[PDB]
Design a protein around this ligand. Structure first.
Ligand SMILES: Nc1ncnc2c1ncn2[C@@H]1O[C@H](COP(=O)(O)OP(=O)(O)OP(=O)(O)O)[C@@H](O)[C@H]1O
Ligand SMILES: Nc1ncnc2c1ncn2[C@@H]1O[C@H](COP(=O)(O)OP(=O)(O)O)[C@@H](O)[C@H]1O
Ligand SMILES: C/C=C(\C)COP(=O)(O)O
Ligand SMILES: C/C=C(\C)COP(=O)(O)O
Lengths: 247, 247
């Protein structure tokens, strides 16, 4: 199954669009298209988080339900705008990135995907297309509405489609000790389960979802600012933090 | 209890006629939330100039890479038009939500042979107004194709079985011949025999799809550029062309 999932962070695409960044990921992906299939998932940044926390989407369909539904739709549109920005950046570089609305195929419960539709994603990957999903608002079976993050989408896609690897693009070089902003913090080039539990005792949700994904595919945590990193993660070279498939 | 409203391409656009969209929004607001509504708006002056250029109807033939690029660009333009329509609906207080047609529907022979409607069902249950659009689509036979709103509403009528399906067109309804031709008379009560005659001698596609929708729901053909025409069509009053449910 020649397929790799790539999670674009929210801080590597915005804070304002980072066009040169997305150009770099597109240039790096063009090295393997179309022999290797690729799925991308991008989060919020100056688009999704403002409207998501302004209308209290995570609160659910409680209180003023009409305003909550209106803000639900508004946040969906605001995320579609940034998705269009990314799609145009990918199309200018010759990559046939196709937008797939996350809220149109996924249903939520306990901030997790309990219902999904993936035949369209398979048909896109088969026809040498590159699907682009996003952390979105979503319908939740428990609290009416919720915020479906990109990590949960990646987890569901890893459990179902079973990619060869999942590569997270973060602002730091990878999984560090304590906090990367500290003066002393060594990069974990080889991350395992016990280390993940150690850091979880004290990100956080990302490491939980990574522990879940490692059951199906390898996981990479690489710095998205460096262009050559992604390729090194696709070819399997030593870069950033690597969590091998569980045995 | 559910009403499927199809918005014609020559109605909403051809360029964007925002005033008539506000008019339609008020018309539906006169009934929300006593009834559930599914909107389907055509291509208009957004998806037509792209699909007619890139020849998406020809399929994945010739320059397949350029065809994929045009696929994605057409989807993005349709998303832009859908964003305009949904913002217009949101300003009127109605909670309209975007549903990408290419994310849940698969095509073969210009017809939906695979669909996903659970998210649509949950949206209708939570008092939302799902808005779909004539969109690019993955065709199982020719790779890529153009899924029109008529096929969308046909599949949705076969599946969800709404109470009635109202087509907003540039004309007052179905005429015994071309409305451009003089002495044109508007058919008040439409039946299968007149449809057979009009087909045996665009509009023909809409008649073909209405013949299939009539087995599940009552069809209306009214002028979209006239406000009250919608309400009279929802209240079952005499307006435009009326196609009773088959028996
Ligand atoms: N041990 C650690 N390893 C890695 N990052 C750490 C660690 N401790 C703290 N951090 C901080 O966690 C932050 C990671 O941000 P976060 O997990 O919220 O994701 P993001 O960039 O917002 O996007 P996304 O969730 O879409 O990937 C960084 O700013 C980093 O400094
Ligand atoms: N017998 C007829 N009755 C009414 N309109 C007709 C007839 N024959 C042709 N037309 C015209 O043909 C056009 C077909 O447009 P159509 O494909 O329905 O647009 P859309 O795809 O946006 O719904 C209509 O604008 C209509 O004016
Ligand atoms: C609108 C969705 C948001 C802000 C969450 O997505 P994430 O950044 O967790 O991928
Ligand atoms: C790009 C979508 C198209 C061309 C379909 O438009 P409709 O027939 O629904 O008006």
């Amino acid at each position: 199954s020649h397929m790799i999932i790539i999670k674009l962070g929210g801080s590597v695409i915005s804070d304002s669009f980072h066009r040169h960044i997305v150009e770099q990921i597109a240039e790096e992906i063009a090295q393997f298209y179309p022999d290797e299939s690729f799925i991308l998932v991008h989060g919020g940044g100056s688009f999704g988080h403002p409207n998501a926390r302004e209308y209290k989407i995570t609160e659910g369909l409680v209180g003023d339900v009409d305003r909550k539904r209106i803000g639900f739709s508004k946040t969906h549109q605001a995320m579609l705008k940034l998705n269009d920005l990314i799609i145009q950046t990918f199309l200018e570089k010759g990559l046939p990135a196709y937008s797939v609305s996350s809220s149109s195929i996924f249903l939520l419960e306990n901030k997790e995907v309990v219902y999904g539709e993936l035949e369209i994603l398979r048909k896109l990957l088969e026809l040498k297309f590159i699907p682009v999903l996003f952390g979105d608002t979503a319908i939740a079976l428990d609290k009416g509405i919720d915020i479906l993050s990109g990590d949960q989408i990646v987890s569901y896609l890893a459990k179902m489609l079973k990619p060869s690897k999942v590569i997270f693009l973060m602002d730091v070089d990878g999984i560090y000790d304590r906090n990367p902003k500290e003066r002393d913090a060594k990069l974990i080039e080889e991350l395992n389960v016990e280390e993940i539990r150690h850091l979880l005792e004290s990100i956080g949700n990302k490491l939980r979802e990574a522990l879940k994904i490692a059951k199906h595919s390898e996981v990479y945590f690489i710095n998205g600012k460096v262009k050559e990193n992604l390729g090194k993660a696709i070819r399997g070279e030593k870069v950033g933090t690597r969590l091998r498939k569980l045995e």
